[PDB]
Amino acid sequence: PTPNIPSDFDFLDATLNLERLPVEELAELRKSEPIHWVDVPGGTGGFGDKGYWLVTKHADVKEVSRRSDVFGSSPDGAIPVYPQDMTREAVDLQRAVLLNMDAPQHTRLRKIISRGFTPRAIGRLEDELRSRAQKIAQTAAAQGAGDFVEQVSCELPLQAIAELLGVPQDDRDKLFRWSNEMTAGEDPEYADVDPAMSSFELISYAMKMAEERAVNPTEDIVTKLIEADIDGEKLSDDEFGFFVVMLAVAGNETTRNSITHGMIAFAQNPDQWELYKKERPETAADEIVRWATPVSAFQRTALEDVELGGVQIKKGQRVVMSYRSANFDEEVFEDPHTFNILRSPNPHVGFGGTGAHYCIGANLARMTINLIFNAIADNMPDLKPIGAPERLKSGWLNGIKHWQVDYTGA
Numbered sequence: 001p002t003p004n005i006p007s008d009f010d011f012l013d014a015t016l017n018l019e020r021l022p023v024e025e026l027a028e029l030r031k032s033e034p035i036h037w038v039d040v041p042g043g044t045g046g047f048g049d050k051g052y053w054l055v056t057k058h059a060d061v062k063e064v065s066r067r068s069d070v071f072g073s074s075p076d077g078a079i080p081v082y083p084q085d086m087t088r089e090a091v092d093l094q095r096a097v098l099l100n101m102d103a104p105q106h107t108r109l110r111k112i113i114s115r116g117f118t119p120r121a122i123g124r125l126e127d128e129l130r131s132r133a134q135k136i137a138q139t140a141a142a143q144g145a146g147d148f149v150e151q152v153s154c155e156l157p158l159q160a161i162a163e164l165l166g167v168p169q170d171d172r173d174k175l176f177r178w179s180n181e182m183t184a185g186e187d188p189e190y191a192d193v194d195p196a197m198s199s200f201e202l203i204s205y206a207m208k209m210a211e212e213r214a215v216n217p218t219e220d221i222v223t224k225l226i227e228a229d230i231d232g233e234k235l236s237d238d239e240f241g242f243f244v245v246m247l248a249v250a251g252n253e254t255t256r257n258s259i260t261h262g263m264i265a266f267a268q269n270p271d272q273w274e275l276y277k278k279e280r281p282e283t284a285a286d287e288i289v290r291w292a293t294p295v296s297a298f299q300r301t302a303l304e305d306v307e308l309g310g311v312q313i314k315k316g317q318r319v320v321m322s323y324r325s326a327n328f329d330e331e332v333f334e335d336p337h338t339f340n341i342l343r344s345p346n347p348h349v350g351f352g353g354t355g356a357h358y359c360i361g362a363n364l365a366r367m368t369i370n371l372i373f374n375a376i377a378d379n380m381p382d383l384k385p386i387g388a389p390e391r392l393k394s395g396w397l398n399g400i401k402h403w404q405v406d407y408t409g410a
């Protein structure tokens with residue numbers, strides 16, 4: 001235990017992160033105790049254990065990601081922190097979705113699901129999504145000023161999911177509503193949502209979608225997923241249901257928050273914003289994701305006694321990967337605290353470290369990001385912040401709820 005950071009300091013506390021990301025504190029661990037145990041003697045929310053290991057170095061985060069055979073996702077799920085009213089029961093059924101599964105079921109399911117995220121599948125959405133990105137930006141610009149999150153950041157990630165699944169336009173409203181209801185669990189502004197009922201209804205909708213496409217096939221990814229490959233592999237209707245639920249949370253608030261933090265970074269760095277508007281560099285999306293790191297941390301659970309960075313980890317202890325720390329590791333990134341959209345190479349772990357659970361939607365997210373910022377630069381290139389960004393109350397998701405902006409910059 002380093003003298004500079006006491007073990008009782010909870011890096012994942014939602015109240016702390018509402019105020020700020022513990023950036024300086026993580027930086028301290030990297031110099032003194034890169035693998036660090038956090039004490040929560042009263043019992044952690046949801047899990048009910050007495051603490052967790054925190055991994056702060058880029059190299060060590062990659063090693064954990066790579067060694068799924070000893071660092072599992074199913075005992076406690078990937079999400080590393082829950083409020084105190086969270087039950088052990090709710091934690092232990094996170095395993096019903098891909099993110100929180102281990103081998104062999106994860107191996108089979110990811111292989112099938114990967115059909116939906118080929119270059120062809122993603123690239124075929126580009127025209128429709130660009131069209132929408134433009135109209136999103138134009139509509140916001142016409143308002144003069146307003147909340148950037150709701151008027152610019154929010155819609156395109158949702159539409160991307162919709163266009164990928166081939167959701168009919170008349171159903172997208174309730175789809176978006178359900179998705180947005182599943183993005184709570186701490187913040188008091190969202191205290192009257194029902195995420196459980198929303199997930200239930202979303203599963204139901206998805207299952208019927210699979211049953212319809214089974215009789216009337218289309219050229220969206222749903223048909224690709226529910227039909228047997230050369231080896232007879234396919235998603236059952238319920239599996240597809242839990243896949244859609246997975247998508248609703250995985251590709252919604254993540255991309256949304258990368259866009260908002262992206263624009264904030266551009267506001268704090270006029271030089272880079274001018275550079276983007278003039279050259280539209282392809283490296284921009286990845287520096288945005290590194291800078292935002294929408295997922296601050298995900299965890300694993302040790303399936304057996306194991307040594308990591310000279311530290312003995314005991315079976316059942318949780319191992320939390322700090323993506324936020326790793327993405328600013330001074331041994332990996334040159335000038336990590338400079339926002340540079342031309343950054344190359346850019347080995348960030350914002351989409352996770354290479355391994356079994358590496359983000360399957362990463363290229364879809366990059367496309368979404370590129371399209372919305374191309375549209376912003378095209379329809380509101382002189383936008384300026386009016387108010388301070390209001391942060392989301394979450395211990396692991398680096399979210400922004402609101403950000404008042406003058407689009408015409410007048």
Ligand code: HEM
Pocket residue numbers: 073078098099100110161246247250251252254255258289293294295298299349350351352353356357358359360361362364365
């Ligand atoms: C900037 C946007 C995004 C970020 C930062 C992000 C981040 C991540 C991260 C860090 C993981 C690793 C989970 C772990 O190792 O425990 C992950 C997994 C995953 N992501 Fe993304 N994601 C983004 C966008 C998307 C989108 C747009 C989709 C789909 C439409 C998506 C679908 C998934 C799925 C299905 C998984 C689970 C894969 C598995 O467990 O095998 N993500 N994401």
